[PDB]
């Protein structure tokens, strides 16, 4: 029963596909690979992927592909199996294209019993808000959580989210109140909340038992480290990771 009762909608698009189709092969060689056969095999590759392999990627998952083809994937479903779907889809598409041809999705969370145009338009606005991050971005749930995928799948979804889950399941003292107070200090964030966070985690370091104190010290020296990182691509990731961990353990 753990998990928030929401459904997500993702809309994808391969970024700059017409540019990757017309010009495409013109950089290597000296214009010697820009034939019709290269573009025909490229069309068969992209068509093969978006019309055959998306059903492979949507095999076990609880979703529905409302459209796939060309370079669009519009898909509704359960939000764990939408985020897992798009992480799997891109991590197979960048193996499929050797890391060329960025794709850039927009995922939006919606409650149950909401109309589907009010749902799809707000997903498509996240998709176009992730087109203009730089180009290659996923836009999780809102206009602000806009991450490059290489800055999302490695950092947020696998590094930080598993560290947060690993800490918050191997204990019993810290609960969701601590996670909520971390989300507030991550969202407001002036320079003063760095000091307030340094006070809060040091108070709770000496409040945990001596069995789990190096466990908490290796978590607070890991949270305070990215909170005060001064690159801005490490604090915004932690807020989305804590949103996903709260959404995983909702009653």
């Amino acid at each position: 029963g753990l998990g928030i009762k929401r459904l997500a909608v993702v809309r994808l698009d391969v970024d700059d596909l017409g540019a990757a189709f017309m010009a495409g092969f013109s950089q290597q060689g000296n214009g010697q690979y820009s034939t019709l056969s290269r573009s025909a095999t490229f069309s068969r590759s992209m068509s093969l992927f978006f019309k055959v392999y998306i059903n492979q990627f949507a095999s076990d998952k609880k979703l529905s592909i409302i459209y796939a083809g060309g370079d669009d994937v519009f898909a509704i479903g359960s939000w764990q199996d939408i985020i897992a779907f798009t992480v799997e889809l891109r991590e197979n598409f960048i193996k499929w294209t050797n890391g060329k041809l960025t794709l850039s999705a927009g995922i939006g969370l919606f409650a149950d019993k909401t109309p589907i145009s009010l749902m799809a338009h707000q997903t498509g606005e996240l998709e176009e808000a992730a087109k203009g991050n730089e180009k290659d971005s996923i836009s999780l749930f809102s206009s602000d959580y806009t991450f490059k995928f290489d800055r999302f799948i490695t950092n947020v979804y696998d590094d930080k989210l598993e560290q947060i889950r690993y800490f918050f399941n191997h204990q019993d003292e810290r609960g969701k109140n601590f996670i909520y107070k971390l989300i507030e200090l991550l969202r407001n964030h002036d320079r003063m909340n760095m000091a307030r966070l340094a006070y809060y985690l040091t108070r709770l370091e000496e409040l945990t038992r001596e069995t789990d104190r190096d466990k908490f010290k290796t978590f607070k020296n890991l949270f305070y480290s990215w909170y005060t990182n001064k690159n801005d691509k490490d604090r915004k990731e932690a807020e989305l990771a804590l949103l996903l961990y709260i959404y995983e353990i909702r009653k």
Partner: protein, 121 residues
């Protein structure tokens, strides 16, 4: 002087300028300054920071004048609070309050001192 962009950084680098216990190796680099000689000084500015949100500055000038007395007195008793409020220029930050905004800036400065005192040692 403290401004809106640097009052937390001065409280960071002032705990680091406060000298610690060089000798007496039992959890060394502990401060001579104790926590309860510092939560008493914050106990004034916390109850001004909670009254400045409601009452006007022309009604709090009886307590704001007495912060200048209490920091002087607590520094006159123990040398460690003297070493605090001379390293962190608190008596020269109390000279400049003049309105609600700089008052709340100083009251957050006094909290950032305590937060970085708790964070180090």
């Amino acid at each position: 002087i403290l401004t809106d962009e640097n009052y937390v950084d001065i409280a960071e680098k002032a705990i680091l300028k406060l000298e610690r216990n060089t000798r007496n190796r039992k959890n060394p680099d502990a401060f001579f300054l104790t926590t309860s000689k510092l939560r008493n000084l914050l106990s004034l500015t916390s109850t001004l920071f909670d009254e400045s949100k409601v009452k006007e500055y022309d009604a709090l000038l009886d307590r704001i004048a007495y912060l200048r007395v209490q920091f002087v007195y607590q520094a006159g008793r123990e040398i460690a609070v003297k070493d605090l409020i001379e390293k962190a220029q608190i008596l020269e930050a109390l000279k400049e309050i003049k309105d609600r905004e700089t008052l709340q800036r100083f009251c957050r400065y006094m909290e950032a001192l305590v937060a970085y005192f708790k964070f180090y040692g």
